[PDB]
Amino acid sequence: AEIKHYQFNVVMTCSGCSGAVNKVLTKLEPDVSKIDISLEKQLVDVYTTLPYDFILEKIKKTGKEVRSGKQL
Ligand SMILES: [Hg+2]
């Protein structure tokens, strides 16, 4: 039952972009504990029990460019 921390650099030009990312993560409740989105750092932090590859894939399918990701 590990709650992992993933961090992504996601290009988000406006609040609609943060909204697109938030939306796909809401569909993965109740196994997403916390999300943090910063437009000022272009960063998305996801705290979840789900696998890294799956989270990355779902964010990428928004069409918002994912520049990089890592586990913390
Ligand atoms: Hg946007």
Side-chain angles (χ1 to χ4, degrees), residues 11-18 64:
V11 181
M12 295 175 292
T13 65
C14 78
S15 66
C17 291
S18 53
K64 312 315 172 189

PDB file of all heavy atoms in Angstrom, residues 11-18 64, ligand 1:
ATOM      1  N   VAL A  11       3.750  21.217 -19.713  1.00  0.00           N
ATOM      2  CA  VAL A  11       3.527  22.553 -20.279  1.00  0.00           C
ATOM      3  C   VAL A  11       2.065  22.949 -20.118  1.00  0.00           C
ATOM      4  O   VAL A  11       1.164  22.279 -20.642  1.00  0.00           O
ATOM      5  CB  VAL A  11       3.939  22.591 -21.752  1.00  0.00           C
ATOM      6  CG1 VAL A  11       3.729  23.999 -22.311  1.00  0.00           C
ATOM      7  CG2 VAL A  11       5.386  22.154 -21.884  1.00  0.00           C
ATOM      8  N   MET A  12       1.867  24.030 -19.365  1.00  0.00           N
ATOM      9  CA  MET A  12       0.516  24.466 -19.027  1.00  0.00           C
ATOM     10  C   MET A  12       0.410  25.982 -19.201  1.00  0.00           C
ATOM     11  O   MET A  12       1.009  26.788 -18.483  1.00  0.00           O
ATOM     12  CB  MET A  12       0.231  24.083 -17.565  1.00  0.00           C
ATOM     13  CG  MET A  12       0.196  22.580 -17.338  1.00  0.00           C
ATOM     14  SD  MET A  12       0.018  22.084 -15.614  1.00  0.00           S
ATOM     15  CE  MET A  12       1.594  22.625 -14.936  1.00  0.00           C
ATOM     16  N   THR A  13      -0.277  26.407 -20.274  1.00  0.00           N
ATOM     17  CA  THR A  13      -0.213  27.801 -20.705  1.00  0.00           C
ATOM     18  C   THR A  13      -1.241  28.689 -20.007  1.00  0.00           C
ATOM     19  O   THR A  13      -1.179  29.916 -20.140  1.00  0.00           O
ATOM     20  CB  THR A  13      -0.432  27.890 -22.242  1.00  0.00           C
ATOM     21  OG1 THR A  13      -1.768  27.460 -22.553  1.00  0.00           O
ATOM     22  CG2 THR A  13       0.528  26.974 -22.979  1.00  0.00           C
ATOM     23  N   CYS A  14      -2.219  28.057 -19.379  1.00  0.00           N
ATOM     24  CA  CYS A  14      -3.351  28.736 -18.770  1.00  0.00           C
ATOM     25  C   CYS A  14      -4.010  27.788 -17.768  1.00  0.00           C
ATOM     26  O   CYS A  14      -3.688  26.588 -17.773  1.00  0.00           O
ATOM     27  CB  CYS A  14      -4.331  29.228 -19.820  1.00  0.00           C
ATOM     28  SG  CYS A  14      -5.474  28.064 -20.597  1.00  0.00           S
ATOM     29  N   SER A  15      -4.971  28.310 -17.017  1.00  0.00           N
ATOM     30  CA  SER A  15      -5.713  27.455 -16.091  1.00  0.00           C
ATOM     31  C   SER A  15      -6.469  26.297 -16.732  1.00  0.00           C
ATOM     32  O   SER A  15      -6.796  25.299 -16.066  1.00  0.00           O
ATOM     33  CB  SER A  15      -6.686  28.300 -15.262  1.00  0.00           C
ATOM     34  OG  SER A  15      -7.711  28.867 -16.087  1.00  0.00           O
ATOM     35  N   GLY A  16      -6.783  26.375 -18.027  1.00  0.00           N
ATOM     36  CA  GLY A  16      -7.423  25.264 -18.707  1.00  0.00           C
ATOM     37  C   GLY A  16      -6.526  24.053 -18.830  1.00  0.00           C
ATOM     38  O   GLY A  16      -6.955  22.896 -18.905  1.00  0.00           O
ATOM     39  N   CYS A  17      -5.214  24.288 -18.895  1.00  0.00           N
ATOM     40  CA  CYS A  17      -4.245  23.192 -19.014  1.00  0.00           C
ATOM     41  C   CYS A  17      -4.098  22.464 -17.695  1.00  0.00           C
ATOM     42  O   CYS A  17      -4.016  21.218 -17.643  1.00  0.00           O
ATOM     43  CB  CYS A  17      -2.904  23.698 -19.527  1.00  0.00           C
ATOM     44  SG  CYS A  17      -2.909  24.249 -21.243  1.00  0.00           S
ATOM     45  N   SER A  18      -3.934  23.218 -16.607  1.00  0.00           N
ATOM     46  CA  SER A  18      -3.977  22.586 -15.282  1.00  0.00           C
ATOM     47  C   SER A  18      -5.284  21.829 -15.089  1.00  0.00           C
ATOM     48  O   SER A  18      -5.306  20.742 -14.510  1.00  0.00           O
ATOM     49  CB  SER A  18      -3.695  23.623 -14.204  1.00  0.00           C
ATOM     50  OG  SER A  18      -4.523  24.745 -14.303  1.00  0.00           O
ATOM     51  N   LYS A  64      -1.336  17.864 -23.591  1.00  0.00           N
ATOM     52  CA  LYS A  64      -0.433  18.725 -22.888  1.00  0.00           C
ATOM     53  C   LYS A  64       0.942  18.061 -22.812  1.00  0.00           C
ATOM     54  O   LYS A  64       1.047  16.918 -22.354  1.00  0.00           O
ATOM     55  CB  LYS A  64      -0.916  19.118 -21.491  1.00  0.00           C
ATOM     56  CG  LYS A  64      -2.339  19.601 -21.414  1.00  0.00           C
ATOM     57  CD  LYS A  64      -2.726  20.583 -22.481  1.00  0.00           C
ATOM     58  CE  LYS A  64      -4.237  20.837 -22.414  1.00  0.00           C
ATOM     59  NZ  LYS A  64      -4.609  21.640 -23.613  1.00  0.00           N
TER      60      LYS A  64
HETATM   61 HG    HG B   1      -4.208  26.196 -21.174  1.00  0.00          HG
END
